[PDB]
Amino acid sequence: DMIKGKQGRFRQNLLGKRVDYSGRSVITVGPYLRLHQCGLPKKMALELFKPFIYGKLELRGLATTIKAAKKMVEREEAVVWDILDEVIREHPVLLNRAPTLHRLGIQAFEPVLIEGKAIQLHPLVCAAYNADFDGDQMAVHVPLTLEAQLEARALMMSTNNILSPANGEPIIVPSQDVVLGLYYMTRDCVNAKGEGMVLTGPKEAERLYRSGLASLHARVKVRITEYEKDANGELVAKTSLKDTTVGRAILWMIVPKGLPYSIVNQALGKKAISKMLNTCYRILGLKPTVIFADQIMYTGFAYAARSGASVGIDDMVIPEKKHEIISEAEAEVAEIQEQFQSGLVTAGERYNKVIDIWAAANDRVSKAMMDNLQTETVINRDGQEEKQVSFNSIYMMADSGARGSAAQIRQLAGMRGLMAKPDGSIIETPITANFREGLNVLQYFISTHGARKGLADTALKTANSGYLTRRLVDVAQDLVVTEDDCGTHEGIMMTPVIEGGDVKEPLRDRVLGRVTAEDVLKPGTADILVPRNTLLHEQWCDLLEENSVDAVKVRSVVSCDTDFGVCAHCYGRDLARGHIINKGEAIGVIAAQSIGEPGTQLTAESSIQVKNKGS
Amino acid sequence: YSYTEKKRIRKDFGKRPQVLDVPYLLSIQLDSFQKFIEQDPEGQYGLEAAFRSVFPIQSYSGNSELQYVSYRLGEPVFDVQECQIRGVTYSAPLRVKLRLVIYEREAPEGTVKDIKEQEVYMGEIPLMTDNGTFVINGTERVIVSQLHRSPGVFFDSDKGKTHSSGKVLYNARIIPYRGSWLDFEFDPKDNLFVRIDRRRKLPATIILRALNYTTEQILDLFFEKVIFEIRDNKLQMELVPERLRGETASFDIEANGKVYVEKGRRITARHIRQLEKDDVKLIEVPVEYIAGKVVAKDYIDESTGELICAANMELSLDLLAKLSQSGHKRIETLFTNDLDHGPYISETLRVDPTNDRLSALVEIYRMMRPGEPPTREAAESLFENLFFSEDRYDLSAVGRMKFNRSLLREEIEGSGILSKDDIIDVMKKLIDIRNGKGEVDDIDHLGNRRIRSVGEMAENQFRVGLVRVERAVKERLSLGDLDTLMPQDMINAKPISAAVKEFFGSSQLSQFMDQNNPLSEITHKRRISALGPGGLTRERAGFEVRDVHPTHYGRVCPIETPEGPNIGLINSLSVYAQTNEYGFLETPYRKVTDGVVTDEIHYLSAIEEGNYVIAQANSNLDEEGHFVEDLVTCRSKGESSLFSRDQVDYMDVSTQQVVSVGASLIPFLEHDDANRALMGANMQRQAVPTLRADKPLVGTGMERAVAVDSGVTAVAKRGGVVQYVDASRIVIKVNEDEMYPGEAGIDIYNLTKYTRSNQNTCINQMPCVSLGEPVERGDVLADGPSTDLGELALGQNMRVAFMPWNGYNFEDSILVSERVVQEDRFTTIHIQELACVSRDTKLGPEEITADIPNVGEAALSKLDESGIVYIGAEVTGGDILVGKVTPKGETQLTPEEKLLRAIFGEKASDVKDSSLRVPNGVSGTVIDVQVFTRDGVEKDKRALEIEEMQLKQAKKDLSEELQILEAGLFSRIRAVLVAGGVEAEKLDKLPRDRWLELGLTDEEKQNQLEQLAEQYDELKHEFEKKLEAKRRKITQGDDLAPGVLKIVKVYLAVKRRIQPGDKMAGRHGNKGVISKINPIEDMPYDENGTPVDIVLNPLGVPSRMNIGQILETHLGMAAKGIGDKINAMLKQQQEVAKLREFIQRAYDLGADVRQKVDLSTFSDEEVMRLAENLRKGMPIATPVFDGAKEAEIKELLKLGDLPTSGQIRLYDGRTGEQFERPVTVGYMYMLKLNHLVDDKMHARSTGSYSLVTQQPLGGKAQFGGQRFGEMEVWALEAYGAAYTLQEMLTVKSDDVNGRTKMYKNIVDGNHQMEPGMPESFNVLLKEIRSLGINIELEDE
DNA sequence: GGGTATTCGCCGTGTACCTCTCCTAGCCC
RNA sequence: GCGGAGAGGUA
DNA sequence: GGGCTAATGACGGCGAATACCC
Ligand SMILES: Nc1ccn([C@@H]2O[C@H](COP(=O)(O)CP(=O)(O)OP(=O)(O)O)[C@@H](O)[C@H]2O)c(=O)n1
Ligand SMILES: [Mg+2]
Ligand SMILES: [Zn+2]
């Protein structure tokens, strides 16, 4: 029993030790931080770095012997804090959040001494940690030796990990306040103060907005100079007059040189911001992406605060035609039930009919509510009127992707759809009331069942996940990239999985970053498109898009010839960094973690119908 | 209204009239334990039942009987408060009257000797407090009710997972309260098997065999016979037409001259009707049809005697021929309809190896006790005691009720023991359901789940103690001599008291009171746990079990349950629900007389609720119990729909009856998603009492019920007038009405000031009332922790604004204004207890003296001469909390050193210090100290001060009571002295003590003076003995554990102010960590200049669909706006008229409300007082589902002269610029949860390491490092981070030489390392090597 | 006897953290 | 006063 | 205090050990 089992041994004491120079505390926002830093309380920092403090104190001669250094730390005089600031300067610390699902659960930051007893965590990284500021706690470790320090600052630092190891996409995308602020900033309005005045650049746009001579969102013609690295790494300024909002100009100030203006020109929601970061990374590189992300955070937070977005009871508009829809559906259900009592339709058929009519009524009310709420601002220009995408705060919260989905908007202002009883069967009468209105005992009770089942599901789901990810990381741990190229010709012919109606997942993403097994030819022989094994980066993928390659044979890890590990080429590039895999990397564990961590949100055919006109 | 209500009335929304008032919320615990003690004649529920169940204890056929008369509960020696103070269990001695009777074996039964024992003592039983808790070692424990499967019979399905080919295999389980379990199950091959409680599966018929039934008797009892007559030739059958339902025809069915069904065509309904109307009984049938049937009885050859065919043997032509030649005219076959009626008992009989009764009992014995050779009488006794022994097998009154109801028997009252008819009926129902004429039961039905409260569980544990002591006494009465011993050497109290204290202290259901909030206590006491003894384990339990069943309606709260791993297994009980007589759950309903909704309420259980169509409470009734709508919304079989007016049997009592108290406290519950309501209630139960609790601006009205019913308030028992008010006691002079005629006196309520609660929070009571105010029975004198004037004030209500403020409220985090810390409104007092124990070692007893070796006089400075800190001294981590000395022995000092010791004064006895020190990093003021000495220990100085402090108070209290009674007696003596010669000049001016020595003319009056003098003497002597008793209790050594000389406890009190990192919450499930303290100027402010207190993130609303906080904020802004207006109108003191008019227009506010506040009472003072209390904002009461609709909030906002939309324009306190799009501001009632960052925060550089595996300790109490778990290891491996992981694995934790070398290297200002091999790995090698496994580290 | 079912029994069931009580026992000298 | 049970709670 | 002695409310998966069916 001592050896076997979780609590006993190997798991507990030989893979699960308990390090020194470590602490724990509650996490807090700290917006002012740089992406590569973290707010650390003074007292924990002193406690952690105690021996460093003693060493530095003795080097400076402030203390004769080690015991005098200890006494000086226990009094905590100004000299001690000065030495702590000096030693902390470049020393990075490791931040960890209790469920380290994937490798981004541990990251290194440079600490900044602060008051208080809570650890301050940079907002952008919360998504990586799955951190929320509602009592989540984090642990903080100190790398001691020089190799450990270099490893923490190089491999684990927040700024070096912007791309998820699972898929190539960015992890640090702005989450909710940032995206709300940016959304507010970029959306335009038909008529405001300063309609249609011409600005020489973003700087006077800011002059106008901060002085209250122009609205934060108002359509305007601005002269802008964008930069494009079209040549071999040189930036060429193109300068012209664009029709934009004040807000879009204000945002443009941050954007680094290489990016096209178009990027900011749109509504700038969650997706738009994410793809903005994506393009910034693909074109410029790491450091500009980091600084640009920090700038995005700051501007988003600032202008979200300036926006003053709130949520009042009237912000969620009951659709005017709800009561009619409900009374109509009730009359229809009454007619179908009476026409059942006479016995022209079975019980199951009546059930199906009622459920379908109720679903249709739910969709009707939802669509009516979305029409009411979506484009209701009928504000007037100089003369006649016009209509536009409303500025209803809950609607902006929905559309921006900051919080909430269409479903929850429905759940607030419409009828909250159908429910499932314990056994999975669907109750005949739905919940017609919404949270803006008040439910009554039955409708509440039903939704209570729903939420209870949900919670229990998440609990058991988490346990099962944990177990699955443990097996995965366990099985694939020893696999390492040992050789540069094994030199095999084998490979798998990879195609895009077109399940039925359309292309669920395209080729380009499926092949990006894989080396080819053999040269593929144009639709005409002796027209080599890709030399023997080449890493298929974005440029090759676009080139394939220009042609009409359908299926590509790529070298896969499973067919790799190398003994006792894998070779760089058979694997490919994909990483938190962009380049071909480096020899030595433990790909087994990264693969297992990437497959395991996301696993916590996992729960007729008569005629064929061609979707697009083709042969 | 009542007086405390007239003080401050709460504006109550809510349209429907409350017919039933909320019951006493703690009814469960008190009523159950009352039922437990309950001296009652007829043995019903109650200790009495246990005694009569276990007693009379008869010898092993020795003819020496033991009889029980009655028991008595001794008066507790220690009251509740003092018992908590002194750290002992609050309990009552239990005394039982017994008789030993010794008879004569050789003569007709006749009592030779009977001796009655003088109420023998059989141990101590803990008592329950007035509030429903238990003091077990000076800690308040609560025994949570337990939900568990009720005794009875249950028919389950267990389908889906049976060989994945369908084959739904049914089972009947008989579960008793006390006794072994019975189980009948099927098998893939439709053979019905029995499995005693949890063993292997035997053929069921063996139990039928054990019951003394012969095979023919069984086949009689179960199968429907079919008769085959032979008349003059060939086999004619008696046929019941209706039996043919659904059967392909196997022969040609001719009747009465006409073929009806051709051979081969399946019998159609037309043919069935034909045959039925024709009245066909007998038809001759071809032998092929019978060529397949089975024989019922064991037909022997009656003539010669040789058996031919046995019972339940398949028939073949040759056997039919033998039967026909033997002369058997009447054949009884079985009816095996492969569709409906199967051959189940037949096939079980075929697999059943046992034949005789004896073989069945042998097989049973080999099942119960495998391996020991069974002897006949052993098996007989085993089987008898299994199901039919009164003592071992008892179902219950409840078990029997459920059993008979399940099998459709009119008789409710049965015998405890399992009778044979019971088993046969159970098997009949099982095979019936197997045919398909019945439904399976669902375990999750509250009609199948029974609640065991405190008294019941205590009774079970006490019975267990009795069975222990009975076996013991049995042996002692058998072996030992009969007539020598008296009835107290024979009976041992040790097992009873052991079992009881084990249950109360160390049990799963006996748990700590969650005692930091009044709500926490009250909700903890009313809890229903599915865990505990005979309960499912939380990890094992499936998700389907933990869901909320429609039966829970109005019985258990659907929304209040811990969201941790045991979600769904806790289920706090709803408001109005009760326990049945049989321990089920029932909820009140209003009767419906066909048209009128009457006012008599009937409590219905789950099953009774199932049958009827029940109308909802929020149904519109006009003036005569008539429904306004023609078709109303009801529920009938667990599904809601519309029913007609003249169909509803009952109607819900009130909207609140669905939810628990915790959930009932949340306002606007109707607008919160169930998830966030759940989390809100669970969190709301964690709030810590602040310094001055005030009130919720937006409540539900339940606050007074919760506060009163919890024991935290001080409530008047006999109404009167407040005579004396102090911040420790309230003394009231009783009203003459309630005044007892004989020996009444006055009522005195001693309050409790800062003491330590289970969670280390402060429990302090403040007086509400003032001198000379009249109080009635049931008013709130003193406010407990976090309650105000009778109302529940869990947290405090502050002005919040929903907006994002430069991402400082980014996630669920919360921003707070420096005004909040300035106004000192989130500062809580906590209280740690520390104990220093001086035991007696064999090298010598340790000492508490202040003379402590090699400590500087700095450490002693704050210690008195006795060695205990002064009360009120401020201490810090590392300061010496109390002084203790460790004895040293075998010193063997050199002779010159001994001479040096004499002059210097050095003590060989000491040289080591065991002094307790304040824990590292905790700093507060010592508010109280207690000292407990055992027998033979001298009282220390501290002991003298504490004894005098308690004594002088006690003296004062006795003196006050005595002085009032003496003044009364003297007044009466003056009233007699005035008769018989008036003397008023001399008398009133001379002292009162000069009234006994005066005289009067010899008459009856002198006789009355002698009477009153002797009464005076009697009062003095009673006073003196009561005083002596109190003084004996104060002085006595407070009994310590064996080996401990004395104990000194020290209480520190610490004022914790809110700071960044602490957790704060609302009532609706919104959470957050306080992220930054902003200066007052930076915080947003409205045009008027008032700054907001909290700036709350809006993005928590849309995805976390708790809209109740928004309406709460709006209504709270409305209430505080009105309150502000009334404060403004009051500061200028216009005139009473204006105030009364305004307050009345506010209290009325529309119509259809059940409020009715006249304001007529006390035209001037009480109205002015009530305005004084509402000036801070008028408290509202929105009930949970019968709440305030938006229009009403709009009206209330308008009455205050505030924007009707509930949003205001705000100016940025930092920049001064306006925010676009006005933002919601208003007052919301927020709570500070017990998760305080300073408790959570922790760091270590180096410290103590663990014993076996030399890794650093885990924890916060001891320094302790964080756990770098396997997931973190994997994280590091995903990177190429080899050196970091290496140091983390060896240098940071496990390598001893490595860690010290690294410390030295770091100190030297160099950063390298020397990893070595972890010590835990070496421990691993040693542990594996300890097995027979050689594991060596090789080298080459 | 040899292959196929069936019972049978063992093995597993997420991380990190924070409070409290309770800890060898019974009988005899 | 290193440990381990039981109970509760946090994310 | 000290001295002496020593029951019942998981579930799935898998592989080995009989039960039995030709
Ligand atoms: N039994 C449990 C329950 C919770 N957790 C942890 O609490 C978090 C759940 O986030 P979550 O996604 O469930 C809620 P949140 O992240 O705040 O977003 P939302 O409120 O807008 O929906 C995860 O980090 C879990 O590891 C756990 O380890 N075990
Ligand atoms: Mg969180
Ligand atoms: Zn390869």
Numbering used by the authors:
A (entry chain D): 329 to 931, 946 to 957
B (entry chain C): 3 to 1342
The authors write:
EC–RapA was reconstituted in vitro by mixing RNAP with a DNA/RNA scaffold to form the EC followed by adding RapA. Cryo-EM data were collected after vitrifying the complex supplemented with adenylylimidodiphosphate (AMPPNP) (a nonhydrolyzable ATP analog) aiming to capture ATP-bound state of RapA and cytidine-5′-[(α,β)-methyleno]triphosphate (CMPCPP) (a nonhydrolyzable analog of CTP) to prevent RNAP backtracking. The EC–RapA structure shows well-defined cryo-EM densities for RNAP (except ω subunit), RapA, and the nucleic acid scaffold except nontemplate DNA strand in the transcription bubble, and single-stranded RNA. The density for CMPCPP binding at the i + 1 site of RNAP was observed, but AMPPNP was not found in the RapA active site. RapA binds near the RNA exit channel of RNAP as observed in the X-ray crystal structure of EC–RapA. Nonetheless, the cryo-EM structure of EC–RapA revealed the RNAP-induced conformational changes of RapA including rotation of N-terminal domain (NTD; residues 1–109) and opening the ATP-binding site compared with its apo-form RapA structure. The RapA-NTD rotates 90° and swings away from the lobe 1 domain. The NTD rotation, together with the lobe 1 domain creates a cavity that harbors the flap-tip helix (β subunit: 897–905) and the zinc-binding domain (ZBD; β′ subunit: 70–88) of RNAP. The RapA-NTD rotation widens the RapA active site allosterically; motif V of the lobe 2 domain moves down toward a lobe 2 helix (residues 540–553). The spatial rearrangement of motif V, in turn, may facilitate diffusion of ATP into the active site of RapA, explaining enhancement of the ATPase activity of RapA upon binding to RNAP and EC.
The structure of all cellular RNAPs resembles a crab claw, with the β and β′ subunits forming two “pincers” that surround the main channel of RNAP serving as the binding site for the DNA template. The pincer formed by the N-terminal and C-terminal regions of β′ subunit, also known as the “clamp,” has been shown to change its conformation during DNA binding and release. In proteobacteria including Escherichia coli, RNAP recycling is facilitated by RapA, a Swi/Snf2 protein superfamily ATPase. To understand the mechanism of RNAP recycling by RapA, we determined four sets of cryo-EM structures, including the RNAP EC, RNAP EC with RapA (EC–RapA), RNAP core enzyme (RNAP), and RNAP core enzyme with RapA (RNAP–RapA binary complex).
